[PDB]
């Protein structure tokens, strides 16, 4: 038992992260065969990135200005090209240490594991949860920019996201590792402010059966709702809606604790027109959102 | 900028993770060099947990009753030995994948990452606190024990605990590297309960100290205090006595932030005393005490 916001273990991504320096700018990159993947802005300095033309910047770069350290081992770049807002470095050996590995986008309000770096080398790993206004809360400082996200199936990296920038409110914005920003943001030193960043409905009843299955049951309550009467509630309270898919996905997790889903539903709804009266769930004194009801089953379960 | 529970990248001691089984217990064992460490309780069924006579049943088991296997290779045991409550075995091959490494036994209130395991395998990777009582708020089911605590400096691995068992409290003891217990914990199901979990309370000033970087300071007041009269209040909360020591190891956050040690001390005072009042601070509405004053240096530097 316990409950804790756990990573997957970032070995296999480790064995990925170089160190790119175009000029003066030093990034991360994501090394897998013979291709290193970063940010585009790699190639501008901070004068640039108020108005960056990125198609005219790249002109003035050649392979031999892409400088590609792999630990302290560098990597001859023999091709370059801008895919969205990623550079594709085409080296001259294919990473050893490549795992077997998918590019994935992912949804909003689906969970990710992120493993920071700086200079090409790691210095932690987080879980994360893509935010429904596409925005990420993570934690990076200068030089983080190239470092990703991903979820691992057993033997399989499937790579989701790659760090760009932090928003003037201090969040985190970032693509897929095909170049495209997750939500509206462009890479771009401009005013960008996030949409409303609404609570992930699913994943915190799915942190509601995890506290159940680990002993922390004092907000059951005697109550049921219905779908529409509890998607009231959760507009009220910057709740995403609840659909019959979410419910679906619960199922499991309904069927484990013997609790239906819409029970669940009853019990987050008086917890939001309640708030916790200074009690604590799963060690938190708020409703958490960054787990998803695949996350919670995972856990429970075991899954190396 | 943004702050979270972040671990230690887990590469390095996933290469030392293998599978250990004599008879029908199977746990995890940590191999460094040409030893594998793993919880002496995998000679025992659950029939003998009750009052286990290790010394006794560890004469029944011989080199090849334990069954070592690296992903899908099999080591061979050429000696077994018990110190306090691990088992060494030693093997015929050296891990190749051995990194520089340290034992190290831990204070309370001190941090470390915990990679889970299962069947040899890493199933995930969090960020601990030794709690105060020596117990560890951890996620652990059945299999997970023989999972390590570690912290990294650079590329020296300093290995801190084991996993052994889980109270009926649901909460987690084990031991350091020689086999020595954390707290009073002994190998035997039998009634052992925690003692009082006091909060760290130089990691929740820290804490307070990593919100004002990132940005969080709506809880900075017009007070100070001093050490007695903080202390009076953190006995009322079963706060950790503050002393000059914790004080000093603040010094570089209240450099860094300009806030002396005691202004903020009287921050934390009227938090104790008054509550969030429905607020967060680094999106928790509770005290985090699970970061170091060092934790708040590395992740606000960047240290890979
Ligand atoms: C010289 N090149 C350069 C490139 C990027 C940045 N910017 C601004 C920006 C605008 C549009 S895309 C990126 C970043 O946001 C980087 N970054 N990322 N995460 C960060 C956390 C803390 C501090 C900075 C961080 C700055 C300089
Ligand atoms: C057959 N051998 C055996 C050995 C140990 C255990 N016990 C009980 C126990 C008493 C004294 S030392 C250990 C554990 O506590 C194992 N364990 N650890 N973490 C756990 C989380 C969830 C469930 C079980 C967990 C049980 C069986």
Not at 2 to 23: D, H, L
Not at 126 to 147: E, H, V
Not at 198 to 221: K, Q, S
Request: with cysteine; glycine share 8%; proline share 4%.
């Amino acid at each position: 038992s316990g409950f804790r916001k756990m990573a997957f273990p970032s070995g296999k991504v480790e064995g990925c992260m170089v160190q790119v320096t175009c000029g003066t700018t030093t990034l991360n990159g994501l090394w897998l065969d013979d291709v290193v993947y970063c940010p585009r802005h790699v190639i501008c300095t901070s004068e640039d990135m108020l108005n960056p033309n990125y198609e005219d910047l790249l002109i003035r770069k050649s392979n031999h200005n892409f400088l590609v350290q792999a630990g302290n081992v560098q990597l001859r770049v023999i091709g370059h090209s801008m895919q969205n807002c990623v550079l594709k470095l085409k080296v001259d050996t294919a990473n050893p240490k490549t795992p077997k590995y998918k590019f994935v986008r992912i949804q909003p309000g689906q969970t990710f594991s992120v493993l920071a770096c700086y200079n090409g080398s790691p210095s932690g790993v987080y879980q994360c949860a893509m935010r429904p206004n596409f925005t990420i809360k993570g934690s990076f400082l200068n030089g983080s920019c190239g470092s990703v996200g991903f979820n691992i199936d057993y033997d399989c990296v499937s790579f989701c996201y790659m760090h760009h920038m932090e928003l003037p409110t201090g969040v985190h914005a970032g693509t897929d590792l095909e170049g495209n920003f997750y939500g509206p943001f462009v890479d771009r030193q401009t005013a960008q402010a996030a949409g409303t960043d609404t609570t992930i409905t699913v994943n915190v009843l799915a942190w509601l059966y995890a506290a159940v299955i680990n002993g922390d049951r004092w907000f059951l309550n005697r109550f049921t709702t219905t779908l529409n009467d509890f998607n009231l509630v959760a507009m009220k309270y910057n709740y995403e809606p609840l659909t019959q898919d979410h419910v679906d996905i619960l199922g499991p997790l309904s069927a484990q604790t013997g609790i239906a889903v819409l029970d669940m539903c009853a019990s987050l709804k008086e917890l939001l027109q309640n708030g916790m009266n200074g009690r604590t769930i799963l060690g938190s004194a708020l409703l958490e959102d960054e787990f998803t009801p695949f996350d919670v089953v995972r856990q429970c379960s075991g899954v190396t």
